[PDB]
Design an enzyme around this catalytic site. Structure first.
Site, PDB file in Angstrom:
ATOM      1  CB  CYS B 133       3.642   2.722 -15.095  1.00  0.00           C
ATOM      2  SG  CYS B 133       2.623   3.501 -13.900  1.00  0.00           S
ATOM      3  CB  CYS B 136       6.073   4.684 -16.844  1.00  0.00           C
ATOM      4  SG  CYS B 136       4.440   5.425 -16.798  1.00  0.00           S
ATOM      5  CG  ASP B 137       8.717   2.594 -14.594  1.00  0.00           C
ATOM      6  OD1 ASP B 137       9.438   3.568 -14.877  1.00  0.00           O
ATOM      7  OD2 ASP B 137       7.907   2.589 -13.657  1.00  0.00           O
TER       8      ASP B 137
END
Ligand SMILES: Cc1cc2nc3c(=O)[nH]c(=O)nc-3n(C[C@H](O)[C@H](O)[C@H](O)COP(=O)(O)OP(=O)(O)OC[C@H]3O[C@@H](n4cnc5c(N)ncnc54)[C@H](O)[C@@H]3O)c2cc1C
Ligand SMILES: Cc1cc2nc3c(=O)[nH]c(=O)nc-3n(C[C@H](O)[C@H](O)[C@H](O)COP(=O)(O)OP(=O)(O)OC[C@H]3O[C@@H](n4cnc5c(N)ncnc54)[C@H](O)[C@@H]3O)c2cc1C
Ligand SMILES: NC(=O)c1ccc[n+]([C@@H]2O[C@H](COP(=O)([O-])OP(=O)(O)OC[C@H]3O[C@@H](n4cnc5c(N)ncnc54)[C@H](OP(=O)(O)O)[C@@H]3O)[C@@H](O)[C@H]2O)c1
Ligand SMILES: NC(=O)c1ccc[n+]([C@@H]2O[C@H](COP(=O)([O-])OP(=O)(O)OC[C@H]3O[C@@H](n4cnc5c(N)ncnc54)[C@H](OP(=O)(O)O)[C@@H]3O)[C@@H](O)[C@H]2O)c1
Lengths: 311, 311
Positions: B133, B136-137
């Site tokens: 992701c 996300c990251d």
């Protein structure tokens, strides 16, 4: 110039700012005429935002968003935007003070405005018993009696909705006739938990520091008065999206809107204008929930990131 | 019978359960094969969910959803669902163990599945420096170096995305040739912050208590092995949406899907089948974020509520 100008600092704009900046947009500016937070800051209680366990006021709910959404470099511009225009391959943002800003991309996140009545007590009791949000506030009145004001599709549909949660719903309208779909009126008429009060007007919303406790109403035909005792009063007398910034010098709209003035978007929150995106209550078929506005904001930001990669 | 069967207990299903039950659905059941929470529970650190300011693990992030989303009567059936079928005007939910359940409406919220490599260390460091992701990251590696594994559209697009945030991206792929769109390969090949390592395989993901710290990589043309020091490793070796429950006894599909198997929905999360809705990563154009999944769940639940009123 600005990489992404976000117009409006409700949940849609704040979420867009968070996502844009955490996705590498170097110069993102949130334009917001007051303190960011949007309409929920008018409410004394929210309990339906997924993941947030404790019931708190709308203002307290939005407080943590200020530090979080700005933690990754978002900039604030405290100003009322008058107009967004496209010029060549960028945008010109005109503020009400006469300042101009230029941006490569724009997210319109200006929300909307429930129509208010000016009924005595409305301003004091807004968000503490007076509501325009049956999904948000209905369940607080589970197995209690509430009143609904209006005679359009929204009022009658929401009376039906509330009738499945509340003990009783008083549907108050200023004529015997309704402008909702006949089929919907039929359904409401046959619901034993809905009591029609027509032709009536509400003269006063009464309560105390903790919120609404009663409505003073009057039959318009007979002038008979009654004091209706309910803790919740839902007003559905119309609604307008905040699309003023779309209006061009020549009176046209910046981008395609529907019959009601809401911005047409696809599933990527793209309008029909390159580099222009929209998010939240301003766009077509918006559910009018914080989580939904925030999701639109994130989606629009992801689309901005993709657009700026290639532009 | 069940008023609404929600298939899958990630953020989409949990949010649908919350909204359905706060909207007066008396018998809503969340079908989830494990503990509700979904894919985020694999991550050691979340910071991007609008309105939740604390930085905590995905498991801890989802803990409060357990109490909140069940506060209004939602029930949890802990079972793997094999199939959802239509039966006259309702639905039949078939579990893998053979149990059947009848429901008036269904929300499909089954998510999707990134393909895993099984490389030594992948399981150990999943969510602790190994990720699928980039949104996300990615930002955790701002101005650091990262590696990306894979040679399809996802790997190469995400390498380009990460190259706008990270100092450098190593794009590792087991062939000199890529299967992404030609223009995407061209963009990546001409991006100064992407270093191609082909033809290579990753033999081990190494780290410590802080998470990933290095990779053991092998050039498969020359058989030369070396260490690559990176704190973040993004794996994009394929993806499948979890649409198995749509497959009927006669091998037909329950509702309309796109070319990849994602469920087609409108802005109300409605499929082409009456009483059947979808939410989260399973539906077309899903952004693959908790706030987006939760928004879809809320929207699908609102549509369920309206559907049940008329049925
Ligand atoms: C009484 C009430 C109770 C509510 N309670 C809940 C609840 O319990 N749960 C829930 O999920 N939602 C609740 N809401 C919020 C609701 O869901 C709204 O739909 C949501 O706030 C919409 O978000 P938005 O960001 O699209 O727009 P808005 O919240 O309207 O935010 C738009 C922002 O844009 C700014 N703006 C507008 N025009 C300009 C301009 N020209 N220049 C600069 N700034 C501009 C406005 O000042 C505002 O801050 C409630 C709303 C009301 C009215
Ligand atoms: C490494 C990683 C890190 C992440 N961190 C973040 C983050 O920082 N921020 C963020 O917003 N998101 C994060 N996520 C979550 C991500 O946003 C996902 O896209 C999101 O979880 C999708 O939610 P969903 O509810 O659609 O599906 P899912 O999360 O996939 O949930 C689906 C649920 O349905 C269940 N299920 C599936 N099929 C069946 C069946 N047949 N029967 C019964 N149960 C079934 C599954 O067990 C699962 O619990 C992360 C994901 C990953 C992989
Ligand atoms: N299912 C659907 O397709 C659907 C659902 C919802 C809304 N809509 C559409 O969206 C648009 C918005 O309609 P909606 O009902 O919000 O409102 P809308 O039809 O304007 O109707 C507003 C209603 O409130 C009444 N009203 C206005 N001001 C008032 C006041 N100050 N005091 C008391 N009553 C007042 C009006 O009374 P009068 O009638 O006496 O003027 C009218 O009944 C409409 O086109 C509607 O059809 C469609
Ligand atoms: N913009 C768009 O339209 C867009 C964006 C993203 C994805 N998509 C589509 O979505 C689908 C999925 O694409 P995607 O890239 O996730 O995956 P995909 O096309 O399957 O590609 C997977 C890649 O990972 C490699 N791989 C597989 N298993 C591996 C392993 N165990 N170890 C190392 N490498 C491994 C494959 O190598 P080999 O090549 O050697 O087999 C391939 O390069 C595709 O149709 C794609 O086109 C479209």
């Amino acid at each position: 110039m600005i990489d992404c100008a976000i117009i409006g600092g409700g949940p849609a704009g704040l979420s867009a700012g968070l996502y844009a900046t955490r996705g590498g947009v170097k110069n993102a500016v949130l334009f917001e005429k007051g303190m960011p937070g949007g309409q929920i800051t008018g409410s004394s209680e929210i309990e339906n935002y997924p993941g947030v366990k404790e019931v708190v006021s709308g203002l307290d709910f939005m407080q943590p968003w200020q530090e979080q959404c700005f933690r990754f470099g978002l900039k604030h511009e405290m100003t009322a935007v008058q107009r967004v225009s496209k010029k060549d391959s960028h945008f010109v943002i005109l503020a009400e003070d006469g300042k101009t800003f230029e941006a490569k991309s724009v997210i319109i996140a200006t929300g909307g405005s429930p129509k208010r009545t000016g009924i005595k007590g409305e301003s004091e009791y807004w968000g503490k018993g007076v509501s325009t949000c049956a999904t948000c506030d209905g369940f607080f009145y589970k197995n209690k009696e509430v009143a609904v004001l209006g005679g359009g599709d929204t009022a009658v549909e929401e009376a039906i909705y509330l009738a499945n949660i509340c003990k009783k719903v008083y549907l108050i309208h200023r004529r015997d006739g309704f402008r909702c779909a006949p089929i919907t009126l039929e359904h409401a008429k046959n619901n034993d938990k809905i009591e029609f009060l027509t032709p009536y007007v509400v003269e006063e919303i009464k309560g105390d520091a903790s919120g609404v406790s009663s409505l003073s109403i009057k039959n318009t035909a007979t002038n008979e008065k009654r004091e209706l005792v309910v803790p919740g009063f839902f007003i559905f007398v119309g609604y307008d999206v905040n699309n003023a910034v779309l209006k061009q010098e020549d009176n046209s709209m910046l981008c395609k809107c529907d019959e009601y003035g809401s911005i047409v978007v696809d599933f990527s929150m793209k309008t029909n204008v390159q580099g222009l995106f929209a998010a939240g209550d301003i766009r077509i078929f918006a559910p009018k929930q914080v989580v939904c506005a925030a999701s639109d904001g994130a989606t629009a930001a992801l689309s901005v990131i993709s657009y700026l990669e290639h532009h």
